[PDB]
Amino acid sequence: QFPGLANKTYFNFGGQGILPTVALEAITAMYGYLQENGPFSIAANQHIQQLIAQLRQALAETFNVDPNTITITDNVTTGCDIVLWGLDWHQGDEILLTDCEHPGIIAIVQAIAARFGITYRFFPVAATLNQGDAAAVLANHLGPKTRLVILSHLLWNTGQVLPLAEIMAVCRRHQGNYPVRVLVDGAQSAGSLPLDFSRLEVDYYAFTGHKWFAGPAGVGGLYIHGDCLGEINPTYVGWRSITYGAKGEPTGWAEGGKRFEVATSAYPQYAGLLAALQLHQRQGTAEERYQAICQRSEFLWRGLNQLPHVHCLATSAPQAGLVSFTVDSPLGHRAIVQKLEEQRIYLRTIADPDCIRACCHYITDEEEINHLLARLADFGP
Amino acid sequence: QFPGLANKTYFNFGGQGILPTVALEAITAMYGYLQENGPFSIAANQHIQQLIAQLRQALAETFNVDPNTITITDNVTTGCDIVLWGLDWHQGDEILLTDCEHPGIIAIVQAIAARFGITYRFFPVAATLNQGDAAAVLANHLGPKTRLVILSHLLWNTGQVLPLAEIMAVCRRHQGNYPVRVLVDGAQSAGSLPLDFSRLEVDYYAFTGHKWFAGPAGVGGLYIHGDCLGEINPTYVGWRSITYGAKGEPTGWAEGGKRFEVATSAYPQYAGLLAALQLHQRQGTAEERYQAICQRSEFLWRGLNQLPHVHCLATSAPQAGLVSFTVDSPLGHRAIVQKLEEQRIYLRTIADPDCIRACCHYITDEEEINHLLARLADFGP
Numbered sequence: 001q002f003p004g005l006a007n008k009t010y011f012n013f014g015g016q017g018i019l020p021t022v023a024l025e026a027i028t029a030m031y032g033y034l035q036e037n038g039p040f041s042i043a044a045n046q047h048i049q050q051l052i053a054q055l056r057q058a059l060a061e062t063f064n065v066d067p068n069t070i071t072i073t074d075n076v077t078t079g080c081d082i083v084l085w086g087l088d089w090h091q092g093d094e095i096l097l098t099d100c101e102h103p104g105i106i107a108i109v110q111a112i113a114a115r116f117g118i119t120y121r122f123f124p125v126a127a128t129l130n131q132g133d134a135a136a137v138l139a140n141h142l143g144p145k146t147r148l149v150i151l152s153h154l155l156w157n158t159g160q161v162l163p164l165a166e167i168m169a170v171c172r173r174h175q176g177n178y179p180v181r182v183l184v185d186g187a188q189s190a191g192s193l194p195l196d197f198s199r200l201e202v203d204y205y206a207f208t209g210h211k212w213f214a215g216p217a218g219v220g221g222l223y224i225h226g227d228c229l230g231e232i233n234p235t236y237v238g239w240r241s242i243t244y245g246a247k248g249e250p251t252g253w254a255e256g257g258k259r260f261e262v263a264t265s266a267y268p269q270y271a272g273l274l275a276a277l278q279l280h281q282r283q284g285t286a287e288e289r290y291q292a293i294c295q296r297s298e299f300l301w302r303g304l305n306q307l308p309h310v311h312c313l314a315t316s317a318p319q320a321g322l323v324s325f326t327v328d329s330p331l332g333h334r335a336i337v338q339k340l341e342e343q344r345i346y347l348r349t350i351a352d353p354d355c356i357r358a359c360c361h362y363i364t365d366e367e368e369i370n371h372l373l374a375r376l377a378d379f380g381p
Numbered sequence: 382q383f384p385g386l387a388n389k390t391y392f393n394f395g396g397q398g399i400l401p402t403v404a405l406e407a408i409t410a411m412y413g414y415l416q417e418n419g420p421f422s423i424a425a426n427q428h429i430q431q432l433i434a435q436l437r438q439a440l441a442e443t444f445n446v447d448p449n450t451i452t453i454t455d456n457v458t459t460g461c462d463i464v465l466w467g468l469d470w471h472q473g474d475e476i477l478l479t480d481c482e483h484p485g486i487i488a489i490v491q492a493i494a495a496r497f498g499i500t501y502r503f504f505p506v507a508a509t510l511n512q513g514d515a516a517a518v519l520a521n522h523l524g525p526k527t528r529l530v531i532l533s534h535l536l537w538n539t540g541q542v543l544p545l546a547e548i549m550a551v552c553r554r555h556q557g558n559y560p561v562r563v564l565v566d567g568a569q570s571a572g573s574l575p576l577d578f579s580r581l582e583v584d585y586y587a588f589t590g591h592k593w594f595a596g597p598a599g600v601g602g603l604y605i606h607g608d609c610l611g612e613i614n615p616t617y618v619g620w621r622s623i624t625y626g627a628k629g630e631p632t633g634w635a636e637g638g639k640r641f642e643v644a645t646s647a648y649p650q651y652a653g654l655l656a657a658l659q660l661h662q663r664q665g666t667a668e669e670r671y672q673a674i675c676q677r678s679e680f681l682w683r684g685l686n687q688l689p690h691v692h693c694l695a696t697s698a699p700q701a702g703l704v705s706f707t708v709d710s711p712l713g714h715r716a717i718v719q720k721l722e723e724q725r726i727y728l729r730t731i732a733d734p735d736c737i738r739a740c741c742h743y744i745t746d747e748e749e750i751n752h753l754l755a756r757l758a759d760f761g762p
């Protein structure tokens with residue numbers, strides 16, 4: 001089902017997943033449908049609307065929520081932009097972000113701070129991978145003007161799964177000028193951790209389809225709890241965002257998540273993500289896949305512990321499929337990742353902390369892990 | 382090269398262009414390159430950046446401008462959203478729009494009005510298709526508080542080519558509170574009218590590749606004159622928008638137009654637009670192509686004039702490839718467009734004014750036009 005795995009040793013799912021054959025077939029079939037029946041026509045436009053609704057529904061079912069809470073986007077970042085630019089910020093309002101957030105997300109925050117006169121402070125979570133409590137660190141940083149906390153459910157740099165439920169309680173127990181809300185960056189978590197937003201109570205959860213879900217680059221989504229929808233004003237909008245009047249004029253915002261969708265998008269790619277989502281559910285439940293992912297990451301982590309010059313950041317088994325580690329060598333992590341790539345072994349360098357990250361998916365196997373171990377064994381001080 | 386033309390009679394280029402074989406080949410080849418070399422790796426990431434640079438450069442050459450003025454987007458609307466949300470609006474600032482702008486664009490202006498307390502009015506341009514002066518109408522509406530004028534270079538509803546140069550001069554000569562700037566919606570003009578931003582001076586020009594340029598749905602762009610760049614603050618941003626420091630931290634904005642680019646997009650589609658652009662230039666100059674488009678639209682227009690129950694909105698030959706008309710019939714224009722599609726003849730209904738629109742491209746032939754005319758003749762009072 002995943003042809004790209006065969007002639008390589010891939011551990012970069014968190015960067016982009018290997019596209020399954022059913023996804024490529026769906027993409028290709030959609031271009032064909034458009035060429036045959038349109039591309040612009042009553043038939044083609046109806047087929048596109050039906051496709052969009054099917055993908056919105058598939059995502060909704062994935063997270064066990066109502067389709068109205070789902071916005072389709074192009075990537076994780078756009079979901080964060082929609083939430084951050086849509087909040088009715090006031091001068092002096094404060095945003096707290098962990099010290100492990102993506103530089104792109106930090107950039108939106110700086111842009112917001114410049115535009116609305118809000119302020120932002122980081123709180124340290126990287127150091128809580130093996131000890132401490134990230135929820136308690138947050139409690140020690142909440143203030144009177146704190147309105148939004150931004151965190152990645154699964155940290156892209158260290159592989160820690162933040163204690164989201166406990167963190168939500170902490171924010172909800174806080175008595176301040178604002179009911180503290182939390183925007184979750186789910187780039188690594190969605191598609192690997194079992195996520196059920198009925199059971200787990202969240203405010204805003206941004207994700208993408210091109211990483212753990214193994215969809216094509218260019219399609220992602222955003223979840224907004226039904227009760228937080230009214231707090232998010234549309235910013236980037238267009239013809240997909242509105243309801244229409246008698247003369248084709250705008251009369252209001254489209255229902256639910258649609259108000260945040262803009263204009264023409266890569267429709268064939270939506271069919272690709274839908275097909276990939278369906279393939280995963282056929283393999284087993286999110287829970288079974290998650291256990292399989294952990295089985296592989298612990299196997300890799302154990303092997304790495306056995307190599308004398310490799311040092312895993314985590315001192316206990318990985319909580320998900322990310323395994324970060326350093327290598328004692330005169331070379332530097334960037335050179336080591338390049339040398340591994342020359343051997344068709346694919347990992348990624350992490351800037352902070354300075355280390356190397358491997359991603360194990362449920363489709364990763366022991367021979368791949370053992371091959372990675374074999375090649376790393378050669379680096380030394 | 383344009384396979385989709387066979388077995389249908391297509392006049393919806395303005396909605397979406399028929400994708401050329403070279404474009405589909407380039408899209409498929411890109412998925413293949415990503416499967417073979419990544420999809421996330423040093424090699425794959427470099428190849429994607431190179432592809433992005435090639436597309437930006439090709440767009441730059443298309444309009445005779447420096448690549449630094451080009452932003453890659455997903456559609457026409459996004460370009461307008463970048464310009465509109467990026468300007469530093471103050472209560473009472475005014476935006477003037479023609480009375481023929483797209484509903485999605487009007488909706489952005491409305492969201493802006495609500496958030497910054499700006500105001501907007503329409504100047505009547507529709508009525509200038511056959512008489513009057515749109516530039517003069519603009520002059521009589523220009524005021525001390527007008528900060529920006531939004532207009533479609535080629536009107537999507539009536540097919541009028543607005544006097545952009547004159548209208549630009551009108552705006553330059555004005556003496557008001559703000560130096561008056563003009564944002565152009567080039568959904569219909571780009572790819573049909575010969576456009577040179579070195580010989581034609583514009584401030585902002587939003588376009589897409591999926592209409593007259595015949596690229597895939599999902600890739601477009603925005604031109605911002607260098608003198609206007611600083612006035613546009615990045616709004617939706619992400620990892621593609623910034624430069625990086627030593628610990629991978631944001632250190633400023635990416636070069637030129639890159640700062641308004643967000644995050645992961647459908648890269649294979651970029652290869653598709655690049656290929657469609659290169660084909661579009663393989664077939665004569667923009668002028669030769671524009672003359673061909675007009676030879677086709679005048680032939681349809683003339684033909685429609687001969688049909689007793691059809692009435693073209695334009696009383697002189699169309700200035701571009703759009704030919705709008707009404708039909709005298711109890712059926713209504715939507716039923717007629719549906720019936721035409723039942724015969725694999727593809728046109729579209731326009732909501733204001735109530736009419737039908739046909740798009741003639743340089744690849745449209747007289748047999749297709751004669752076919753549409755034979756079937757249209759069947760309707761009557």
Ligand SMILES: Cc1ncc(COP(=O)(O)O)c(CNC(C)C(=O)O)c1O
Binds near residue numbers: 076156619644
């Ligand atoms: C926490 C997190 N947020 C946001 C993103 C940006 O992805 P989009 O392009 O979908 O907005 C990533 C991607 N990470 C990568 C690439 C990685 O860690 O290898 C991420 O890990």
Ligand SMILES: Cc1ncc(COP(=O)(O)O)c(CNC(C)C(=O)O)c1O
Binds near residue numbers: 397569
């Ligand atoms: C003037 C104008 N502006 C903006 C758009 C929206 O395009 P994007 O999806 O690329 O933002 C269109 C679309 N027209 C159509 C569909 C038509 O003429 O049939 C348009 O004609």
Ligand SMILES: N[C@@H](CSS)C(=O)O
Binds near residue numbers: 620
């Ligand atoms: N290439 C950078 C972009 S920051 S989202 C990275 O993925 O680390």
Ligand SMILES: [K+]
Binds near residue numbers: 306310
């Ligand atoms: K070790």
Ligand SMILES: [K+]
Binds near residue numbers: 685691692
């Ligand atoms: K007539």
